[PDB]
Amino acid sequence: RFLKVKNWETDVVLTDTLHLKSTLETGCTEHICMGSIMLPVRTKDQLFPLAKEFLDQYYSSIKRFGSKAHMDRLEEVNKEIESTSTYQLKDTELIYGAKHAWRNASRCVGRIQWSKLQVFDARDCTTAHGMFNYICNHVKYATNKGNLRSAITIFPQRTDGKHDFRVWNSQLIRYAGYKQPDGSTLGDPANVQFTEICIQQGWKAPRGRFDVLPLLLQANGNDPELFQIPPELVLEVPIRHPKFDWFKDLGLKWYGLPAVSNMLLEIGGLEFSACPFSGWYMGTEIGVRDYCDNSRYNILEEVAKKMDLDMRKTSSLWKDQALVEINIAVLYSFQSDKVTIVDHHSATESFIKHMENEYRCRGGCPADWVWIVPPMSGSITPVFHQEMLNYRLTPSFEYQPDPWNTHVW
Amino acid sequence: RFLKVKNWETDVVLTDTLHLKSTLETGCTEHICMGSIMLPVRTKDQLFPLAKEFLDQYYSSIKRFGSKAHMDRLEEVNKEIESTSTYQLKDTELIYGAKHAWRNASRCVGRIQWSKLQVFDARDCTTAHGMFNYICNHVKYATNKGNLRSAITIFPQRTDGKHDFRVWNSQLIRYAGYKQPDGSTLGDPANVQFTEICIQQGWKAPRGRFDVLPLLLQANGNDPELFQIPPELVLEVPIRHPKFDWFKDLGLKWYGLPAVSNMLLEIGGLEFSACPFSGWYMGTEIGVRDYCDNSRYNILEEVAKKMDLDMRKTSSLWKDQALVEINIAVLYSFQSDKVTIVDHHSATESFIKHMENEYRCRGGCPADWVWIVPPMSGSITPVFHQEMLNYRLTPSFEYQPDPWNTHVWKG
Numbered sequence: 001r002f003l004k005v006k007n008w009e010t011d012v013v014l015t016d017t018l019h020l021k022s023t024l025e026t027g028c029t030e031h032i033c034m035g036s037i038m039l040p041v042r043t044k045d046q047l048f049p050l051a052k053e054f055l056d057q058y059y060s061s062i063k064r065f066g067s068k069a070h071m072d073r074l075e076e077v078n079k080e081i082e083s084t085s086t087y088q089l090k091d092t093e094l095i096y097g098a099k100h101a102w103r104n105a106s107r108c109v110g111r112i113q114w115s116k117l118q119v120f121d122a123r124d125c126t127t128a129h130g131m132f133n134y135i136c137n138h139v140k141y142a143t144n145k146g147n148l149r150s151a152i153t154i155f156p157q158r159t160d161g162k163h164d165f166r167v168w169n170s171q172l173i174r175y176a177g178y179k180q181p182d183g184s185t186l187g188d189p190a191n192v193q194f195t196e197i198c199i200q201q202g203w204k205a206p207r208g209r210f211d212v213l214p215l216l217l218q219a220n221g222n223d224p225e226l227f228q229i230p231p232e233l234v235l236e237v238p239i240r241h242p243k244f245d246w247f248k249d250l251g252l253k254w255y256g257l258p259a260v261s262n263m264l265l266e267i268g269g270l271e272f273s274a275c276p277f278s279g280w281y282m283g284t285e286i287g288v289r290d291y292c293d294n295s296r297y298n299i300l301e302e303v304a305k306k307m308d309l310d311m312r313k314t315s316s317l318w319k320d321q322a323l324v325e326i327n328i329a330v331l332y333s334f335q336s337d338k339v340t341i342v343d344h345h346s347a348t349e350s351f352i353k354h355m356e357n358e359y360r361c362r363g364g365c366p367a368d369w370v371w372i373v374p375p376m377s378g379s380i381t382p383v384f385h386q387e388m389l390n391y392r393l394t395p396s397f398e399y400q401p402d403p404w405n406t407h408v409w
Numbered sequence: 410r411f412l413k414v415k416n417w418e419t420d421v422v423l424t425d426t427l428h429l430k431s432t433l434e435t436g437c438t439e440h441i442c443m444g445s446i447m448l449p450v451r452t453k454d455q456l457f458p459l460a461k462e463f464l465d466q467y468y469s470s471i472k473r474f475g476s477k478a479h480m481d482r483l484e485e486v487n488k489e490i491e492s493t494s495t496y497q498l499k500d501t502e503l504i505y506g507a508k509h510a511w512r513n514a515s516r517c518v519g520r521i522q523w524s525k526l527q528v529f530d531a532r533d534c535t536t537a538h539g540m541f542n543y544i545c546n547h548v549k550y551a552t553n554k555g556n557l558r559s560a561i562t563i564f565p566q567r568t569d570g571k572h573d574f575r576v577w578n579s580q581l582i583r584y585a586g587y588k589q590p591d592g593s594t595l596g597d598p599a600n601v602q603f604t605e606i607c608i609q610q611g612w613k614a615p616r617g618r619f620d621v622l623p624l625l626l627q628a629n630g631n632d633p634e635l636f637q638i639p640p641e642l643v644l645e646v647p648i649r650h651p652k653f654d655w656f657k658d659l660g661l662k663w664y665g666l667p668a669v670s671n672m673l674l675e676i677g678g679l680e681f682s683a684c685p686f687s688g689w690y691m692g693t694e695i696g697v698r699d700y701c702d703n704s705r706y707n708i709l710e711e712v713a714k715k716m717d718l719d720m721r722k723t724s725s726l727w728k729d730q731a732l733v734e735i736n737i738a739v740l741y742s743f744q745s746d747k748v749t750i751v752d753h754h755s756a757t758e759s760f761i762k763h764m765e766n767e768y769r770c771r772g773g774c775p776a777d778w779v780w781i782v783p784p785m786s787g788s789i790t791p792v793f794h795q796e797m798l799n800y801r802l803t804p805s806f807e808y809q810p811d812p813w814n815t816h817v818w819k820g
């Protein structure tokens with residue numbers, strides 16, 4: 001229970017002590033590692049230890065641990081739980097909880113930024129229409145005309161769990177997908193289902209390739225409702241290449257704001273089932289994953305053809321060649337249009353710096369190597385050579401299943 | 410208990426029951442995953458269970474579980490253990506054991522090949538000179554003039570742990586590394602320490618960028634002895650690029666035969682501390698790791714320079730550009746000289762078909778994702794998208810510390 005991590009490129013060894021404060025289960029056992037499995041109410045009794053654990057860490061953070069003000073809040077929260085079966089966070093607590101859920105997100109390479117997070121408190125929200133208003137304000141604030149700013153917006157916490165707030169979308173901004181008589185897929189094959197659910201709720205799809213999807217918002221356990229985000233709030237980037245004049249003709253674009261909206265924020269045992277958050281893209285996610293995944297826009301073959309490469313044998317590395325050029329183009333387009341983006345070299349470098357800060361100041365940094373190492377050029381980024389320990393700390397973000405599977409109408 | 414893995418590209422779901430046969434520990438717990446941590450004598454007492462488990466597996470494999478042959482062999486081994494504290498494997502058991510250790514090796518993408526392995530039984534070897542000869546024969550057989558054949562050579566097992574056979578080299582063929590007084594390195598920085606031991610053991614080093622190291626071989630717990638592999642036996646490939654004609658003048662070459670020599674093979678509780686084995690390269694190992702790791706030959710800068718790439722910002726992806734070209738060159742060069750090599754697209758596709766076949770016939774296939782996914786172009790290979798379960802089956806290969814840290818010098 002005192003663990004070393006070694007970087008094999010630099011020989012730097014760091015000692016992890018933070019893992020001992022870890023609480024939740026990993027999915028791994030002594031006999032089986034589940035490191036690469038993507039997926040490996042609360043009663044009164046369960047809630048007070050959770051609240052106490054959180055308030056202790058909070059009061060510790062502001063150097064008032066064991067102070068009258070610490071004990072008094074523990075007292076206040078205990079009474080409120082006993083009498084109301086739940087409790088409410090102070091603004092200061094909510095801000096701290098959200099920043100720490102990000103600090104603890106072991107799959108997140110950009111956490112050097114964790115303390116610069118603008119938190120929008122949407123706990124007074126009561127309808128879908130209000131949710132939409134909050135989300136547009138989030139979008140406009142975060143986008144900031146291309147100078148992106150990290151933000152989260154936090155809707156009301158769970159109660160009896162039959163009144164959840166949820167954003168049905170997996171991200172605030174994504175593109176539609178429709179399956180055609182042709183048998184192929186137009187637009188984003190990842191969202192075919194969600195797009196069907198939208199149309200059957202009433203969306204009129206402009207039956208195209210890069211149709212920004214409508215929001216489906218569920219306030220207070222109600223049936224969700226549709227809203228189109230103002231087109232003028234969705235900053236999109238046309239994709240061109242600095243050297244390939246034909247590239248623009250693929251007709252590719254992507255949206256500037258990555259904004260995850262399906263997670264559950266847990267703070268001091270309280271559960272925030274709608275907490276859309278956003279930062280800015282690492283270029284590989286668009287160029288490697290969205291564009292080149294087989295099940296996504298799947299554009300390797302068309303780009304390779306346009307480059308006039310040898311597609312007859314895997315060993316000519318035509319896929320690898322086209323992959324790099326696609327990613328040069330994503331970075332180039334975002335940079336030309338002055339929209340914040342980070343390349344994988346720069347993002348992984350800052351993360352190693354972040355890991356070292358966290359090791360000296362905090363005793364560790366939970367990190368999931370399988371997600372942290374970029375989907376291309378892994379071993380030429382410093383994170384490939386860095387041992388990481390993965391463990392679960394709270395406050396946390398947790399993945400929740402798609403609500404259409406669940407919800408009753 | 411059943412455990413499922415998903416492929417996120419295909420939605421193919423597989424069910425693992427084989428993990429139930431797993432003995433050793435992973436390093437992970439309910440509270441911590443050590444999946445990216447590189448490193449996470451027996452008594453009679455622990456030995457007969459291990460022997461029994463093994464022979465039961467062997468006898469099942471051949472469809473004679475519970476036969477008189479099976480029961481006779483159990484009795485025979487038990488008696489040998491109580492009487493001598495160890496036991497000897499029959500040839501058939503050794504072969505089966507060394508194949509299964511490969512089969513079980515969760516970090517190996519090449520395992521579709523597992524049933525095709527040449528086993529050289531070197532258990533009669535007694536001296537380092539005898540080890541050299543065995544290793545020469547292995548290299549010649551495996552190389553096969555570029556038509557590479559997988560092989561393993563198995564030296565006598567551990568006895569009291571004071572009489573170990575070991576190959577001090579980490580692979581049979583690697584290049585020397587010389588650390589210069591200015592702090593630069595000539596040749597391979599990975600082999601600096603070992604090169605320095607060779608030299609101290611009396612090696613006359615040529616001091617160039619690609620000097621094949623001498624074998625340093627330890628027999629029967631004795632101090633290791635130096636041998637030069639006959640150069641005519643060391644197949645090498647000069648590295649050139651199909652389109653860039655300046656690439657040859659970087660002066661690069663690599664050896665054709667990757668041959669891991671530092672691992673410990675465990676079969677049925679017995680420990681084979683010298684068991685060099687070899688297959689053939691996947692190109693990325695040379696082109697990504699050996700050439701492009703910063704702590705190795707580190708050629709990215711020189712290549713990208715010659716390619717006239719924009720090097721002022723990482724966002725030009727100049728490193729990634731130079732990386733692909735170097736890997737094209739490695740594959741082209743090997744193919745042009747008719748030396749077996751597999752590209753990472755081909756090897757991963759084959760591995761997925763192997764893993765799937767194993768789930769159907771064996772009830773699973775332990776795989777270490779962190780190692781199986783190639784160190785370039787990860788997500789455009791099918792393995793990236795494949796959930797894997799990592800666990801430890803015997804027979805097995807295990808890492809062992811370098812012997813210069815443990816050896817009792819006899820002088």
Ligand code: HEM
Pocket residue numbers: 098101102105107108109110111113117150151152260263277278279280281282285342347371397399
């Ligand atoms: C500011 C720039 C940021 C960068 C460059 C960044 C980078 C990334 C990347 C590349 C991923 C992988 C996503 C994927 O592969 O789908 C990720 C995952 C994640 N990040 Fe960040 N991040 C940023 C901001 C944020 C913020 C503001 C939060 C929360 C407050 C956050 C929390 C998370 C979480 C919880 C995941 C895992 C998502 C999942 O399980 O689907 N990140 N991060």
Ligand code: HEM
Pocket residue numbers: 507511514516517518519520522526559560561672686687688689690691694751756780806808
């Ligand atoms: C036949 C062609 C083969 C190919 C293409 C192949 C591919 C690979 C690759 C790329 C690695 C990772 C190497 C590294 O990163 O250092 C590996 C690891 C490994 N393979 Fe293979 N392999 C082959 C044959 C074999 C054979 C013949 C054996 C033993 C009989 C073997 C057992 C292992 C073991 C134990 C590891 C883990 C090595 C370690 O921990 O350092 N492989 N395989």
Ligand SMILES: Cc1cc(N)nc(C[C@@H]2CNC[C@@H]2OCCN[C@@H]2C[C@H]2c2cccc(Cl)c2)c1
Pocket residue numbers: 038039171258259260277278279280281282285399
């Ligand atoms: C089954 C499953 C589990 C989990 N935990 N996540 C997913 C979502 C799956 C997992 N990686 C792909 C897909 O995510 C796409 C969304 N990417 C984030 C937008 C990008 C991003 C980038 C930078 C900053 C931020 Cl805030 C967000 C699926």
Ligand SMILES: Cc1cc(N)nc(C[C@@H]2CNC[C@@H]2OCCN[C@@H]2C[C@H]2c2cccc(Cl)c2)c1
Pocket residue numbers: 447448519580667668669686687688689690691694808
């Ligand atoms: C600390 C440590 C632990 C372990 N388990 N292995 C290592 C050796 C580390 C692990 N990746 C780098 C270094 O290996 C270089 C040798 N690679 C084998 C040549 C390649 C190979 C390729 C194809 C077929 C075969 Cl039989 C063998 C180091």
Ligand SMILES: C[C@H](O)[C@H](O)[C@H]1CNc2nc(N)[nH]c(=O)c2N1
Pocket residue numbers: 035036037038370371372417793794795796797
């Ligand atoms: C099975 C495997 O865990 C899965 O493909 C993972 C691999 N690593 C990843 N890494 C990131 N950042 N995002 C992902 O979606 C994935 N997918």
Ligand SMILES: C[C@H](O)[C@H](O)[C@H]1CNc2nc(N)[nH]c(=O)c2N1
Pocket residue numbers: 008384385386387388444445446447779780781
């Ligand atoms: C820290 C990390 O586990 C380490 O760098 C690993 C990652 N994956 C690897 N994969 C292979 N094939 N070989 C390696 O040496 C490594 N090194």
Ligand SMILES: [Zn+2]
Pocket residue numbers: 028032033034035437441442443444
């Ligand atoms: Zn694990």
